[PDB]
Design a protein around this ligand. Sequence first.
Ligand SMILES: *[C@@H]1O[C@H](CO[C@H]2O[C@@H](C)[C@@H](O)[C@@H](O)[C@@H]2O)[C@@H](O[C@@H]2O[C@H](CO)[C@@H](O)[C@H](O)[C@H]2NC(C)=O)[C@H](O)[C@H]1NC(C)=O
Ligand SMILES: *[C@@H]1O[C@H](CO[C@H]2O[C@@H](C)[C@@H](O)[C@@H](O)[C@@H]2O)[C@@H](O[C@@H]2O[C@H](CO)[C@@H](O)[C@H](O)[C@H]2NC(C)=O)[C@H](O)[C@H]1NC(C)=O
Ligand SMILES: *[C@@H]1O[C@H](CO[C@H]2O[C@@H](C)[C@@H](O)[C@@H](O)[C@@H]2O)[C@@H](O[C@@H]2O[C@H](CO)[C@@H](O)[C@H](O)[C@H]2NC(C)=O)[C@H](O)[C@H]1NC(C)=O
Ligand SMILES: *[C@@H]1O[C@H](CO[C@H]2O[C@@H](C)[C@@H](O)[C@@H](O)[C@@H]2O)[C@@H](O[C@@H]2O[C@H](CO)[C@@H](O)[C@H](O)[C@H]2NC(C)=O)[C@H](O)[C@H]1NC(C)=O
Ligand SMILES: *[C@@H]1O[C@H](CO[C@H]2O[C@@H](C)[C@@H](O)[C@@H](O)[C@@H]2O)[C@@H](O)[C@H](O)[C@H]1NC(C)=O
Ligand SMILES: *[C@@H]1O[C@H](CO[C@H]2O[C@@H](C)[C@@H](O)[C@@H](O)[C@@H]2O)[C@@H](O)[C@H](O)[C@H]1NC(C)=O
Ligand code: NAG
Ligand code: NAG
Ligand code: NAG
Ligand code: NAG
Ligand code: NAG
Ligand code: NAG
Ligand code: TN7
Ligand code: CL
Ligand code: CL
Ligand code: CL
Ligand code: CL
Ligand code: CL
Ligand code: CL
Ligand code: NA
Ligand code: NA
Lengths: 176, 527, 352
Amino acid sequence: LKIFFPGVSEFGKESILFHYTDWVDDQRPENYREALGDVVGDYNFICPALEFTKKFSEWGNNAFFYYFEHRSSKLPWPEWMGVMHGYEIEFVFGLPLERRDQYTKAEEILSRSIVKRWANFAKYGNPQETQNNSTSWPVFKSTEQKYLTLNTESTRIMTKLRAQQCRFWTSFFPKV
Amino acid sequence: DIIIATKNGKVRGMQLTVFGGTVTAFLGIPYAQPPLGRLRFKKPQSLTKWSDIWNATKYANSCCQNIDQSFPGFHGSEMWNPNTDLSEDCLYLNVWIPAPKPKNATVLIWIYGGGFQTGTSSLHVYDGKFLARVERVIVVSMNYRVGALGFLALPGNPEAPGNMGLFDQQLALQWVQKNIAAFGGNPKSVTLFGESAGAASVSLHLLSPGSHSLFTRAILQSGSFNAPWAVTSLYEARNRTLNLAKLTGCSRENETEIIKCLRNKDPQEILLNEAFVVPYGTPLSVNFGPTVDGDFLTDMPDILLELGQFKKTQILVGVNKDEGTAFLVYGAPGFSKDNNSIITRKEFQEGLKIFFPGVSEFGKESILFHYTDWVDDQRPENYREALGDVVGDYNFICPALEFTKKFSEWGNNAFFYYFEHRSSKLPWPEWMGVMHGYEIEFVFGLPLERRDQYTKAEEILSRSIVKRWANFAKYGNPQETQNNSTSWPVFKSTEQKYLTLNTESTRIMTKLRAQQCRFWTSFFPKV
Amino acid sequence: VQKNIAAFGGNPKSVTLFGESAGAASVSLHLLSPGSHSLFTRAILQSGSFNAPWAVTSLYEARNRTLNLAKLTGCSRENETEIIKCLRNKDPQEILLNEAFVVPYGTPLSVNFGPTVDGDFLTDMPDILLELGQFKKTQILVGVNKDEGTAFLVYGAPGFSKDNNSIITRKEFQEGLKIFFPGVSEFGKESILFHYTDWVDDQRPENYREALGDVVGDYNFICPALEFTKKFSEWGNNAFFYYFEHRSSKLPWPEWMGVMHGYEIEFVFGLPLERRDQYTKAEEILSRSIVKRWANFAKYGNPQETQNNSTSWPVFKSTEQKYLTLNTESTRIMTKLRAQQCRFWTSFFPKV
Ligand SMILES: *[C@@H]1O[C@H](CO[C@H]2O[C@@H](C)[C@@H](O)[C@@H](O)[C@@H]2O)[C@@H](O[C@@H]2O[C@H](CO)[C@@H](O)[C@H](O)[C@H]2NC(C)=O)[C@H](O)[C@H]1NC(C)=O
Ligand SMILES: *[C@@H]1O[C@H](CO[C@H]2O[C@@H](C)[C@@H](O)[C@@H](O)[C@@H]2O)[C@@H](O[C@@H]2O[C@H](CO)[C@@H](O)[C@H](O)[C@H]2NC(C)=O)[C@H](O)[C@H]1NC(C)=O
Ligand SMILES: *[C@@H]1O[C@H](CO[C@H]2O[C@@H](C)[C@@H](O)[C@@H](O)[C@@H]2O)[C@@H](O[C@@H]2O[C@H](CO)[C@@H](O)[C@H](O)[C@H]2NC(C)=O)[C@H](O)[C@H]1NC(C)=O
Ligand SMILES: *[C@@H]1O[C@H](CO[C@H]2O[C@@H](C)[C@@H](O)[C@@H](O)[C@@H]2O)[C@@H](O[C@@H]2O[C@H](CO)[C@@H](O)[C@H](O)[C@H]2NC(C)=O)[C@H](O)[C@H]1NC(C)=O
Ligand SMILES: *[C@@H]1O[C@H](CO[C@H]2O[C@@H](C)[C@@H](O)[C@@H](O)[C@@H]2O)[C@@H](O)[C@H](O)[C@H]1NC(C)=O
Ligand SMILES: *[C@@H]1O[C@H](CO[C@H]2O[C@@H](C)[C@@H](O)[C@@H](O)[C@@H]2O)[C@@H](O)[C@H](O)[C@H]1NC(C)=O
Ligand SMILES: *[C@@H]1O[C@H](CO)[C@@H](O)[C@H](O)[C@H]1NC(C)=O
Ligand SMILES: *[C@@H]1O[C@H](CO)[C@@H](O)[C@H](O)[C@H]1NC(C)=O
Ligand SMILES: *[C@@H]1O[C@H](CO)[C@@H](O)[C@H](O)[C@H]1NC(C)=O
Ligand SMILES: *[C@@H]1O[C@H](CO)[C@@H](O)[C@H](O)[C@H]1NC(C)=O
Ligand SMILES: *[C@@H]1O[C@H](CO)[C@@H](O)[C@H](O)[C@H]1NC(C)=O
Ligand SMILES: *[C@@H]1O[C@H](CO)[C@@H](O)[C@H](O)[C@H]1NC(C)=O
Ligand SMILES: *[P@@](=O)(NCC)OCC
Ligand SMILES: [Cl-]
Ligand SMILES: [Cl-]
Ligand SMILES: [Cl-]
Ligand SMILES: [Cl-]
Ligand SMILES: [Cl-]
Ligand SMILES: [Cl-]
Ligand code: NA
Ligand code: NA
């Protein structure tokens, strides 16, 4: 935290530790390794994108939010790093559609679907995949805060991604 | 010395140390006249009354029943087998109360599953002392008759009316209405809970006029009467009564004579022939089960449910992630608890033949069509997983979801869970996942016992479930209000919100198995 | 009263409990107690509710304190019915003299022996009863005073005196928290300092003196009464909330202590209606109005003063959170008393 939050008062940093180290439970050895990742990802990318999306949508416009949870089968980085920053991009641009490339079949299908959703968004303002009995992507509103998860098995509609975490980053931390 | 005076006599209980505190257990209190001799196959009769002290210091006889002998030596299956002597003289219940005696405790009454053919209240996974200790509720459980001896039916003939086992449960609920104040319980705050057939039973006490004033609220784990195994049609019931006659050489012409004959058979000759009263059966057969008898159950209960004719109260309903896998090792080709059971398309198809006896060929093609649209045809465990889902969705999950929708459409709060935690101690192999029956130990709080080798995340999960079930029972609302827990939303038609129960993060989701159940619920009943 | 008040001309079917501070907490627990449900009609809670941090003793602390008092009276035993037997031979005075010590640290707000979840009067942690709507369904009237917390500061906070203006320093403030929040981790206490010392601006010398008062009053009385009122009203019942902001003209305590805990009570009971007594005229009129509002609440479930073109008192709901201020000039309808403060006490602090 000292590395990621240069200063950042000591209280500022205790408050992060307090919010992120309430284990269930203190048993798991990878507790702290996972918490530091979540800290960095929640502060720097996830809570801000969620707050931009809420505020933007409050003026009337359709907005669609995704949570991408697929780890590339070819990721060169180790397992503990999971579904890393930057690694949705190859799915968006359709690299997995190239069969010569050693991505799995479930990855071809995932990328094909994302490519269609992004293109429909672009052409028609709506990121649906309308032809293959796909989960329909609901608009994101303040209040319900629905989002779509993107993964090779079942995509799901969920609500209020990182609610508690972002209440911390978004409401409180800007104050320290 | 703890002696309690009941309407029928005194009973002495015993003290138990639980978690550094004390629970008093009264194991094996009688609650009806033993159903022997002339009383075999009849509704349970009133208890007569005793002076001196009945000692309720151990579990009583379990009712007569066939036993699971498929895996001798194996805990996975042997844990469900009866653990007290079998006897027709089995109409007893158990009471567990916290110490010191509570003043007006809410009461939880457990009804066990076992397909209506087996089960007993004295299993270790139904031990109510943790709940009593931890939540200061009173837990009651009862033995009721199963198999032909509990459900034989010759429609409208009082010598074999049907539903005798459900009337055992009811008379036990009556016993609590009359006696639980004496143990410090509140007859006005009674919640029935049950799993599998015990849940189906709970769901029929919701429809039975005779049970309406014997309880307050209801919990249904992995079962409801609209499951395809839970209610026997009058047609099948006669066919099965006569078939059992024939097999015991009791065919007659006067039907009260068939029954008289049957009352001379030895329990063992009845049990031994139960399996055969049906030409084909499956790992999920319920040869003798609830019927519309015009007494306990006044009309086809699908009609009662649709038309809103049941007790208006809150319900809590749930199911497990892999309800269907347990049954596959009992007859589906290529399936074994001792390997990973990768089966083939042709085995899958044979498997359906095992689970759907007939079931037209179109009927079965339609299941294959709905469940074998892979994404994609690559994964070797595709067919093994599909067969599990087929069995679990048809038999437990879609029916519980449809019961919950229909019940809630008449105005009552209903709460639905999806239990997705696999026990760290499960003796069954990994591929079987979160099996039918294996939430029960979490509900009863076994993982709260640290000596027992459950993980820490499992203690915390069970502690939370125990609190949610107790809050449901006491207050009609399964919240855990103190530890920044996810709040459990009521289940409504339209949104269909449910709570997932697991050791990491519990989540609110919507429309469990939407596509699957559209298939089972709307279309399949038609084939 | 249920059995006898008809004989004195009273209606047992129209009974309103009222209480202040611990007496209000008591009223709020008769709302949760099944045994009290049919012994009263409505309830008034002045400066107190059971969810205040001082109002309910945990079973853990209660045993620790019973045994500690045994030990101090030389009544430690092994059979517990013997501890009690022993204790029943002590002289009242030996019990009283040791009460203060059954706890290692205490504060000016200690409640060493208070309500517990006994499985009889109180059947479950009452925070769970409140959250899940398990209480008597009826109207409530709830309120607090502008400076609930100041009274307690002259009983142990450094640099505070009833005999001067008590301008304290940042370092004294911090010591003061140590007095009111025994432990309470260091982070716990930094968080209070952070929330309450964001001045506008760092100029005013009475900054820290005022913050310590607000800290004590907000944690101990105001945010809890506001949270009780929200939660109670969410189950459907009319609830009315006041903010009392009048300082008695006869208050013997110094000016800096403002509108203190306990000092609405004389207005409620109508002492200022006695002209011989040296209260001002605006105080007679204020008390007359409060007496009528409390009596209308009691008789009719509605604390209006209907005859003198008075501000009408709106019910308190979740969402708008309207309250009425009680003062000698103009009473006003306002919303969301201490919103930011109580978000801190109510949502966050219980976590530290
Ligand atoms: C109603 O029951 C009859 C009875 O048949 C059974 O005789 C019993 C004693 C028992 O041993 C049982 O296994 C045996 O089948 C059923 O009739 C049988 O149906 C099967 C399949 O259709 C035929 O192959 C048998 O020939 C036939 N037997 C007789 C005597 O007719 C009947 O199927 C059943 N009703 C249903 C639809 O399940
Ligand atoms: C997983 O085991 C099944 C179950 O049947 C077998 O159990 C094994 C552990 C072994 O002891 C074997 O003797 C026992 O019969 C296997 O299914 C069997 O597959 C074999 C193919 O060689 C057939 O001969 C059997 O008919 C069939 N058993 C039945 C009746 O269901 C299964 O093949 C095995 N699968 C694996 C290892 O992937
Ligand atoms: C539970 O009570 C014990 C008892 O300690 C007390 O003994 C009493 C007779 C009384 O005089 C009281 O002042 C004294 O503290 C508490 O244990 C004490 O805790 C303090 C602070 O942690 C320690 O400094 C003492 O050494 C310790 N004494 C003993 C005998 O162990 C204990 O703190 C209390 N529980 C809590 C958390 O308040
Ligand atoms: C306001 O008074 C406080 C209270 O303590 C003092 O009360 C005074 C009226 C006086 O009689 C004094 O004797 C009495 O102790 C003062 O706090 C005191 O500050 C002095 C600093 O000189 C310290 O010596 C004391 O420790 C401290 N008292 C304690 C124990 O709290 C306070 O300084 C004074 N403030 C003013 C005048 O602004
Ligand atoms: C025990 O409580 C009785 C009623 O309490 C219940 O009210 C019911 C309608 C139901 O909602 C329950 O969940 C409530 O708990 C009361 O009438 C009895 O007098 C009490 N018996 C005692 C304390 O002896
Ligand atoms: C006194 O009034 C009794 C009822 O009046 C009360 O009704 C209650 C439900 C409650 O709302 C109170 O506030 C009402 O004032 C009536 O039944 C008695 O008979 C009366 N007794 C007398 C006049 O002797
Ligand atoms: C639709 O599904 C088919 C397989 O049925 C697949 O070939 C194709 O990739 C899908 N189209 C899109 C846009 O995903
Ligand atoms: C009941 O148990 C007690 C054990 O103390 C015994 O005194 C009494 O004889 C028992 N009654 C029986 C076994 O019939
Ligand atoms: C059948 O036998 C019963 C039993 O004794 C008898 O009561 C009845 O009369 C008989 N039924 C008829 C009339 O066929
Ligand atoms: C609340 O959480 C605490 C840990 O902070 C734990 O000890 C306890 O099990 C929890 N209570 C419930 C009902 O889960
Ligand atoms: C404790 O003493 C009480 C008071 O006489 C007595 O009733 C009881 O038997 C004792 N408790 C035990 C068994 O330790
Ligand atoms: C109404 O106002 C009059 C003065 O016009 C005053 O005498 C009296 O105190 C008031 N009544 C109430 C209930 O305040
Ligand atoms: P349930 O009682 N349903 C089976 C028919 O589960 C145990 C087999
Ligand atoms: Cl852990
Ligand atoms: Cl999340
Ligand atoms: Cl695949
Ligand atoms: Cl699903
Ligand atoms: Cl300033
Ligand atoms: Cl304010
Ligand atoms: Na903070
Ligand atoms: Na079809």
